[PDB]
């Protein structure tokens with residue numbers, strides 16, 4: 001049995017986790033959400049849900065991965081019946097790889113288009129521009145008709161052939177991903193030294209550029225404006241809970257995979273605290289750049305900052321490029337901005353594909369000795385299934401996947417994972433494992449958060465996400481009913497692995513229905529006890545313990 005590889009340095013693991021957590025959305029979505037829900041007031045619920053349910057779940061995932069020394073699927077030897085959860089998260093990661101890499105392809109396309117003295121999104125005396133342009137705006141028109149070519153597609157049912165420019169950019173992104181992941185963590189941990197730190201350098205450059213622009217200080221003030229009376233709204237609290245759930249990186253199996261390569265005696269508690277703090281602070285600080293630029297644009301157009309900020313995939317390819325085109329040395333700033341976008345997306349894509357590859361390789365030993373070939377297969381499958389999003393109507397497929405690929409699926413996966421780790425396995429045994437690893441047993445606060453607060457919070461978020469579901473849309477396009485049905489099928493194909501694997505495991509285990517249950521819910525480490533008839537999970541005391 002080949003010894004499992006470990007991170008060459010700890011800075012490798014920390015930067016991998018930070019690069020995965022810090023992505024395009026986290027840098028450009030969170031501050032906009034904060035502004036839209038009371039600005040600084042939105043930090044009250046967010047932090048709260050970070051203290052009681054976010055940090056505990058991050059810590060749980062890291063500790064579980066580190067102790068069990070396996071990926072998302074192999075980690076579930078603590079409760080075999082729930083092992084499908086692993087596959088669920090893996091599937092989600094795989095699904096997110098079929099559309100997320102197209103964002104990096106768009107960023108690469110804009111980067112190659114930025115090496116010119118005349119940026120192609122400053123005016124609309126171009127072949128791709130409709131007569132209606134009047135400074136839809138030139139930047140939005142360029143994005144939609146010169147890069148995506150949406151005007152040539154009538155909807156998700158009229159995708160058309162893949163675009164060769166976008167296909168070439170996707171090929172470049174895919175090659176980068178493969179050569180970043182083919183050798184394991186020994187190369188990924190060194191690639192994150194560049195892809196996880198360049199975004200901060202470019203963000204500092206853009207922050208120093210923006211604050212000096214006219215009208216940027218007004219945008220910053222609007223960002224930091226505190227409206228506590230907005231906290232009486234349930235929408236603010238629901239948005240905070242949803243943002244905490246979807247901004248941490250839990251539910252994809254990536255934290256488990258990353259921590260599975262950590263030394264057993266590593267301190268996952270400090271790692272969780274540090275990484276969560278860095279991710280949250282990065283998301284908060286990116287708001288200063290976002291809203292300096294938004295306030296500058298608002299002053300230029302003489303409109304409220306709320307009107308400038310659009311919502312959608314092209315929020316980073318329409319508004320910020322438009323602001324950059326108006327700066328001195330606009331070409332250099334555009335190149336820097338799109339390099340930052342590439343480095344923000346590439347590390348997250350690497351983290352997701354690492355989750356997929358680690359989980360599947362750990363599950364099946366046939367792929368253990370061949371990681372290069374399996375990485376090539378996974379990457380080529382991602383590329384081939386990513387070709388639907390680079391078609392003429394590729395924004396519609398991208399929107400469908402972005403809405404349904406990791407929505408309620410992530411929340412359900414994290415909920416079932418928390419239940420399995422805190423109830424089926426027990427917070428007592430999890431705490432004993434953490435004490436064995438780090439030497440310090442989790443305090444009562446962590447145990448209570450894992451056992452009671454986190455499951456209730458995740459169940460509430462799942463329920464509100466299902467109840468307040470709104471079908472996806474792009475611009476004036478209304479997705480057809482069959483498109484919504486296909487999206488729900490995609491969302492449920494991840495989550496159905498839990499019941500499917502539960503049924504398969506229950507039927508596979510030999511014995512009566514009391515032997516099957518005992519061997520399915522009891523940890524594999526307790527096998528001897530289960531043989532004598534000493535199942536902890538069969539005692540009410542186990543379930544009521546904290």
Ligand SMILES: CC(C)CCC[C@@H](C)[C@H]1CC[C@H]2[C@@H]3CC=C4C[C@@H](OC(=O)CCC(=O)O)CC[C@]4(C)[C@H]3CC[C@]12C
Nearest residue numbers: 043047050051055273276277280281284442443445446
């Ligand atoms: C969005 C902007 C304002 C950035 C601020 C966010 C982070 C800096 C916050 C979000 C969640 C917070 C954490 C939530 C929970 C805890 C556990 C807490 O520990 C305890 O409650 C005691 C238990 C024990 O010591 O065993 C120590 C602070 C810490 C790490 C918090 C540190 C600060 C964090 C990372």
Ligand SMILES: CC(C)CCC[C@@H](C)[C@H]1CC[C@H]2[C@@H]3CC=C4C[C@@H](O)CC[C@]4(C)[C@H]3CC[C@]12C
Nearest residue numbers: 095098156157158159385386388397486490493
């Ligand atoms: C395992 C699977 C479900 C994960 C997601 C893969 C993606 C890339 C797949 C799954 C279902 C696919 C869609 C199935 C139906 C159609 C209608 C057809 O007229 C054009 C292609 C289009 C719009 C496909 C686009 C790509 C698609 C969204």
Ligand SMILES: CC(C)CCC[C@@H](C)[C@H]1CC[C@H]2[C@@H]3CC=C4C[C@@H](O)CC[C@]4(C)[C@H]3CC[C@]12C
Nearest residue numbers: 011014015018196197198200201202204274278
């Ligand atoms: C011009 C400046 C801002 C660019 C540099 C910013 C980058 C390199 C900085 C910003 C935040 C930093 C991280 C913050 C704290 C830690 C925890 C420590 O235990 C290991 C290093 C690590 C993980 C840092 C690595 C470098 C880092 C990612």
Ligand SMILES: CC(C)CCC[C@@H](C)[C@H]1CC[C@H]2[C@@H]3CC=C4C[C@@H](O)CC[C@]4(C)[C@H]3CC[C@]12C
Nearest residue numbers: 090094360363364365366367378380381382385
């Ligand atoms: C539409 C595409 C992208 C979906 C890919 C799904 C993944 C999870 C599938 C595709 C091929 C599969 C492998 C095919 C061959 C074997 C050998 C056999 O002993 C079962 C396990 C194993 C190793 C499978 C594991 C799961 C696997 C890697």
Ligand SMILES: COC(=O)[C@H]1[C@@H](OC(=O)c2ccccc2)C[C@@H]2CC[C@H]1N2C
Nearest residue numbers: 021023093096097100247249348349352
């Ligand atoms: C698309 O989903 C994401 O963007 C997630 C994540 O991305 C992926 O999980 C992923 C998976 C496969 C391919 C590409 C990206 C990065 C950060 C952390 C959680 C969230 N994001 C804030």
Ligand SMILES: [Cl-]
Nearest residue numbers: 247279280283
């Ligand atoms: Cl966040």
Ligand code: NA
Nearest residue numbers: 019022023348
């Ligand atoms: Na990232």
